[PDB]
Scaffold this active site. Structure first.
Site, PDB file in Angstrom:
ATOM      1  N   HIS A  99      -3.977   2.917 -16.758  1.00 38.77           N
ATOM      2  CA  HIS A  99      -2.855   3.591 -17.410  1.00 38.77           C
ATOM      3  C   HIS A  99      -3.004   3.715 -18.905  1.00 38.77           C
ATOM      4  O   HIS A  99      -2.136   4.296 -19.564  1.00 38.77           O
ATOM      5  CB  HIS A  99      -1.547   2.869 -17.046  1.00 38.77           C
ATOM      6  CG  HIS A  99      -1.413   2.766 -15.547  1.00 38.77           C
ATOM      7  ND1 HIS A  99      -1.914   1.701 -14.839  1.00 38.77           N
ATOM      8  CD2 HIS A  99      -0.941   3.661 -14.636  1.00 38.77           C
ATOM      9  CE1 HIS A  99      -1.683   1.903 -13.545  1.00 38.77           C
ATOM     10  NE2 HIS A  99      -1.087   3.080 -13.403  1.00 38.77           N
ATOM     11  N   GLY A 137      10.911   2.921 -25.471  1.00 41.09           N
ATOM     12  CA  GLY A 137      10.669   3.500 -24.150  1.00 41.09           C
ATOM     13  C   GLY A 137      10.079   4.909 -24.287  1.00 41.09           C
ATOM     14  O   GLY A 137       9.222   5.334 -23.511  1.00 41.09           O
ATOM     15  N   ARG A 173       9.231   8.416 -29.575  1.00 40.88           N
ATOM     16  CA  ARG A 173       9.755   7.455 -30.527  1.00 40.88           C
ATOM     17  C   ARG A 173       8.602   6.647 -31.140  1.00 40.88           C
ATOM     18  O   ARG A 173       8.608   6.372 -32.338  1.00 40.88           O
ATOM     19  CB  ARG A 173      10.810   6.513 -29.962  1.00 40.88           C
ATOM     20  CG  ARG A 173      12.193   7.174 -29.896  1.00 40.88           C
ATOM     21  CD  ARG A 173      13.221   6.385 -30.646  1.00 40.88           C
ATOM     22  NE  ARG A 173      13.967   7.147 -31.640  1.00 40.88           N
ATOM     23  CZ  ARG A 173      15.257   7.470 -31.554  1.00 40.88           C
ATOM     24  NH1 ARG A 173      15.976   7.099 -30.496  1.00 40.88           N
ATOM     25  NH2 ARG A 173      15.845   8.149 -32.536  1.00 40.88           N
ATOM     26  N   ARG A 221      -0.938  10.017 -19.290  1.00 36.12           N
ATOM     27  CA  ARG A 221       0.411  10.293 -18.830  1.00 36.12           C
ATOM     28  C   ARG A 221       1.340  10.614 -19.993  1.00 36.12           C
ATOM     29  O   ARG A 221       2.542  10.310 -19.940  1.00 36.12           O
ATOM     30  CB  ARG A 221       0.958   9.070 -18.083  1.00 36.12           C
ATOM     31  CG  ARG A 221       0.519   8.939 -16.652  1.00 36.12           C
ATOM     32  CD  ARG A 221       0.704   7.473 -16.182  1.00 36.12           C
ATOM     33  NE  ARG A 221      -0.022   7.267 -14.945  1.00 36.12           N
ATOM     34  CZ  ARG A 221       0.395   7.627 -13.737  1.00 36.12           C
ATOM     35  NH1 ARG A 221       1.564   8.212 -13.562  1.00 36.12           N
ATOM     36  NH2 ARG A 221      -0.381   7.373 -12.689  1.00 36.12           N
ATOM     37  N   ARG A 281      10.007  -5.105 -27.794  1.00 32.15           N
ATOM     38  CA  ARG A 281      10.546  -3.846 -27.287  1.00 32.15           C
ATOM     39  C   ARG A 281      11.693  -3.400 -28.181  1.00 32.15           C
ATOM     40  O   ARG A 281      12.556  -4.244 -28.536  1.00 32.15           O
ATOM     41  CB  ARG A 281      11.052  -3.972 -25.843  1.00 32.15           C
ATOM     42  CG  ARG A 281      11.944  -2.804 -25.445  1.00 32.15           C
ATOM     43  CD  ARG A 281      12.892  -3.138 -24.319  1.00 32.15           C
ATOM     44  NE  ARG A 281      14.143  -2.394 -24.405  1.00 32.15           N
ATOM     45  CZ  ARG A 281      14.261  -1.077 -24.410  1.00 32.15           C
ATOM     46  NH1 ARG A 281      13.186  -0.299 -24.334  1.00 32.15           N
ATOM     47  NH2 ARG A 281      15.479  -0.530 -24.506  1.00 32.15           N
ATOM     48  N   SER A 339      17.528   1.700 -27.448  1.00 32.52           N
ATOM     49  CA  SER A 339      18.971   1.877 -27.546  1.00 32.52           C
ATOM     50  C   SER A 339      19.595   1.168 -26.346  1.00 32.52           C
ATOM     51  O   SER A 339      18.888   1.016 -25.346  1.00 32.52           O
ATOM     52  CB  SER A 339      19.326   3.369 -27.459  1.00 32.52           C
ATOM     53  OG  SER A 339      18.742   4.071 -28.541  1.00 32.52           O
ATOM     54  N   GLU A 346      20.551  -2.311 -20.840  1.00 34.04           N
ATOM     55  CA  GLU A 346      19.346  -1.500 -20.927  1.00 34.04           C
ATOM     56  C   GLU A 346      18.599  -1.602 -19.618  1.00 34.04           C
ATOM     57  O   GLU A 346      19.249  -1.868 -18.577  1.00 34.04           O
ATOM     58  CB  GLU A 346      18.513  -1.803 -22.150  1.00 34.04           C
ATOM     59  CG  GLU A 346      18.331  -3.277 -22.485  1.00 34.04           C
ATOM     60  CD  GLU A 346      17.212  -3.864 -21.637  1.00 34.04           C
ATOM     61  OE1 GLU A 346      17.524  -4.444 -20.587  1.00 34.04           O
ATOM     62  OE2 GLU A 346      16.037  -3.670 -22.039  1.00 34.04           O
ATOM     63  N   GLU A 369      14.804  -2.615 -19.239  1.00 31.78           N
ATOM     64  CA  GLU A 369      13.467  -3.181 -19.071  1.00 31.78           C
ATOM     65  C   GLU A 369      13.239  -4.558 -19.600  1.00 31.78           C
ATOM     66  O   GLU A 369      12.203  -5.152 -19.209  1.00 31.78           O
ATOM     67  CB  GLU A 369      12.421  -2.184 -19.519  1.00 31.78           C
ATOM     68  CG  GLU A 369      12.624  -1.303 -20.657  1.00 31.78           C
ATOM     69  CD  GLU A 369      13.597  -0.165 -20.611  1.00 31.78           C
ATOM     70  OE1 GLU A 369      13.458   0.813 -19.835  1.00 31.78           O
ATOM     71  OE2 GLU A 369      14.588  -0.226 -21.403  1.00 31.78           O
ATOM     72  N   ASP A 396      25.833   3.539 -27.313  1.00 34.55           N
ATOM     73  CA  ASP A 396      27.017   3.956 -26.576  1.00 34.55           C
ATOM     74  C   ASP A 396      27.848   2.772 -26.097  1.00 34.55           C
ATOM     75  O   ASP A 396      27.336   1.666 -25.907  1.00 34.55           O
ATOM     76  CB  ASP A 396      26.581   4.801 -25.358  1.00 34.55           C
ATOM     77  N   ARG A 419      23.092   7.313 -35.886  1.00 34.82           N
ATOM     78  CA  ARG A 419      22.204   6.707 -34.893  1.00 34.82           C
ATOM     79  C   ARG A 419      20.783   6.602 -35.431  1.00 34.82           C
ATOM     80  O   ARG A 419      20.137   5.554 -35.310  1.00 34.82           O
ATOM     81  CB  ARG A 419      22.223   7.515 -33.591  1.00 34.82           C
TER      82      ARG A 419
END
Lengths: 232, 234, 232, 237, 232, 237
Positions: C4, C20, C24, C43, C87, C90, C179, C181, C204, C212
């Site tokens: 990967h 994620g 970003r 990917r 990590r 948001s 979140e 993960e 949120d 933001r």
């Protein structure tokens, strides 16, 4: 000498009465047994050995909850040769046909704990008392004219439960009383090849929100008389 | 005036140190606190309130296991206004990098108990300590030249486990020490909105098999806990 | 040269920041790192290595969810020598005391996933961050006048949850942010003996329904300053 | 007039003996009851009503496995007023303390089924018999000189288990016999407020390979039924 | 305009082909579809809409794992009116009667994930494909003389499994291939009233340790031909 | 010569039709097969072997519920060489898209039982039918003008469920019908390497309270059996 009990093999009788409170064990040794001598005191969990009508009998606190109770009965059995355990205590009732101060005998013990699932490969282990001990206690009660209710107890892990709706399920399924260690004791006796029985007196009615000392004495006389009956 | 604690509101301080052994609570009260007086004794579960360097602090046994521990700390929090609980005790180690007499802080606590699944709809609740308490304890130890390991404790339901191969799994995942009540205390703290921390001293090595030295190391753990209270107050 | 990640050993630094969104990662590489160069793109999962105040640092997307995140951080750790993973992302808040734009640090991470139960014989594994990384991040934020909330994240398997009543349970138990993960990253860090931390910005408010970019930049700076504080 | 039982209210007595095999029900009604009349036959599941020492008693097959026995016991209780149920069958032993031809009484019933977890919010329900029925059955056997092993049965969902190592676990925990319906009968009895009991005769030893002949098994089976019917009279008082 | 998909209602056809890799979605759009135009690119998860033999068809990546794939298919169905989803990918084989480069169709999908247990009150939900889609794909394969194996896929949560003994269980129960999202897609299709199908090409033999591009093309032609067959 | 089946190897064909009720097996063997001979009757569970258009076919009851079902299918497969099993029964509908008298095929089978979790290390096993049998049955019904609903069955452990809110969950997820044995048959078929299919006729609607006469039910049942038998010949080709 074990980690949680500072006594030697032979200090305990082959039968042990066990209230949760160590001060109740001290009360029993002083008021119901003849010549009781203290045999253990680690962590203030008092245990005594004396005689009842000439029969050697021990009495020792087991603390609160399954984990605490399992440690003590496990050590009594594998290190002190105890064969029979009679847990004695107070329980909460959830069903309408059981009133405060009634004496209940746990033929079986339901639970929300995972300990029996860890022993039984995650299947349903029916934690049950030893039949001859149940019979002995019911006969000891009848002899004194005390009525007893024989059925399922429920051993809760959390005294302050986050799920109160479970008391309505217990009720519908006939649970006779809610305490916190019977399912653990029964599990330990099965694992180690010993025999157990839990006897309770209803101190509170969880549902209806509903002497105590005197009813406690009847429970103790029943348990002790069941020991002599059991020897025959 | 609760069912398991025969004291009055105001008897305990807002911070309580909790060994499992009531006799340990007595030892701590007598040797580390000033002018400590007993505040409770139902079921022989001794509780004392004294002072450490001018700061009011309480010490009380919580018995053995999650159910016992939960009853006491729940009553302490909801009826006695207790805000911070520091459990102090002995644990077994399963990892080779941790030796007997090492001091470990349980930032999280794994368990084979169902109490947190009952609370959290059968999902995985991460039973964790309050970060500031971990931090205060880690700084207190550093100021005393004591190295502490901060990580995951494992709270066992069965001391005489029917599955000893679990110790190899715990080791593989980094568990720093095995005890019996930390996951329950953290679960209660989260339910009643309080703060908790578990500090332990490795008294036994479950894998390798490994009083004076233990007493000494026990005193070291007590000093750290008490000094963390003062660092935590600032 | 893994399945990967199409990079070579040495392409990543020993510390990796992981949003994620791969876009970003590109944003972070371009605006916060000096001389960052792309090191992978299989990917479309962009990965970059650059420098922050003279310290070599990597940034790479990990995609969405526990399974995706586990693949990337596992390969980073076992094949690329990665020692620390932070990590960044948001999250949604369920608690009234936490507001949108608040920065939260996940000292622990709850989950409705089964991955840690598969690793831990179906018992409760407490997925927690490395203490030192938490401490560094909290120190970094304090030095920038940013108040951070340190506590429990909840890593959901289903973004479009079939059970929205779980949000009230999370709130009741103090969850600081939701979140998808962190519990997987912490579980992988424990399985492969690495260190990890999850930092998030509340984008949120799941309960109240509630700049933001600005707060996102705040979270990136804290993470990067924590790496330097963590090196001392 | 229920879906699985083609009888009318009053056809069954308030106490029903239940073997798994409908032919054993026929055999019991013929050889142990007086003036037995067949009262139902849906799906070849024979049910009869007869009399034992003047007391009205019914005998009915319940098929194999928890789901099948739950359907029949539930219908008997809610549609036909049955108060007490006694299951009488064959079980396999796993413990060396128990021998082939032994009579075992299930005071409790362990299981690998999820039926009681569905009823009890996924907690551990101790599937138990009615104490007074256990006691009547135990006294009745003692009065006939038969020594009974009172303990935990294990109700298996898969006869041809994919995990035979579970038998070694059952032996360690003292299971007295392995069958397939007790835990389900006990769950139903608790859900609907009736009383139940499972009595079994050991026909095979799972652990030691022990077998018995069909003669011996017929005889031990005959003992079991006499104990059960005697226990009904003792239980009436 | 959804959170993870930057497109408008109408941009996607009613049937979407979905490889996990967005670059694979790009390769399909450019090589098999006529006049494909990119309709989304948030998080680099490319999605395209073109035409196959005059039939409007979309192709979009879904990332790796159940959680990721669930977000995308859920949004396509509830926000973009997608009725049929065909996942295309590579899978690992565990059974001896399945060789590398074989084409397998997941009539059902086993899993170690908890997502279907959260939807189905903790009971066993059989995650299955839509029968008419399976049939169409098997007929499309026969038309081109390609043999396909129809059976159970296994959707793993962990690519790098801590429990490899599970491959032997899969093999014994006839699993035809191991991938990571079919069980999640089938769950979403059921929950939202849509239809799904997973088609895979065996890229590796997990057991025996055992062209690829050409077998990939066969898989894609079969899926696209199944779409036209399905419209009749 | 197995414990539950009193037949000899070769008495059964390689394909067996299986209704729950043994009297329905008798009905099928008498009315749809040629020269049907009864081959077993242990516990009144009738099994027959006859011929359909010259093709050897067997029919046998399997009792109610997964456990009973598993025992018989497991014995047919491991002791008698059966390769394909088709369960033919009645089911209840929970979805408004399915009407009483509909013919449903269980491509998959959901369940609240633990038998597939015991077999599959506690993970989620998708209990599925054999694709080529589904396809043969689907084409056979199409050829007869019968429109079948292919989908997920739900195999319940408790007929008299303590949790009726589960029916609203099955509806939302598209379950085509509720029965009691498909998930267990599919698990056995996968454990032993055999092939299975469950076909059902909708006799009642659980959600709308719809019922059907006994006449209508006989006819729809008659259609199902012809579909099954036709699927066997198509399956051979």
């Amino acid at each position: 000498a074990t980690p949680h009990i500072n006594a030697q093999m032979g200090d305990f009788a082959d039968v042990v009465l066990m209230p949760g409170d160590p001060l109740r064990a001290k009360y029993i040794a002083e008021n119901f047994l003849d010549n009781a001598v203290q045999v253990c005191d680690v962590r203030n969990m008092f245990g005594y050995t004396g005689t009842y009508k000439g029969r050697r009998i021990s009495v020792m606190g087991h603390g609160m909850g399954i984990p605490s109770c399992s440690i003590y009965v496990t050590e009594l059995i594998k290190d002190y040769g105890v064969k029979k355990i009679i847990r004695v205590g107070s329980c909460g009732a959830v069903n309408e046909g059981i009133k405060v101060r009634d004496v209940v005998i746990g033929m079986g013990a339901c639970t929300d704990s995972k300990v029996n699932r860890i022993r039984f490969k995650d299947h349903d282990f029916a934690a049950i008392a030893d039949y001859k001990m149940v019979k002995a206690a019911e006969e000891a009660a009848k002899a004194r004219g005390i009525d007893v209710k024989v059925g399922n107890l429920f051993s809760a892990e959390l005294f302050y439960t986050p799920d109160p709706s479970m008391f309505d399920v217990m009720d519908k399924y006939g649970i006779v009383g809610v305490e916190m260690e019977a399912a653990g004791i029964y599990g330990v006796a099965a694992e180690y090849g010993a025999k157990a029985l839990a006897i309770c007196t209803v101190s509170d009615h969880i549902k209806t929100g509903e002497e105590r000392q005197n009813t406690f004495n009847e429970m103790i006389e029943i348990a002790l008389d069941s020991v002599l009956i059991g020897d025959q």
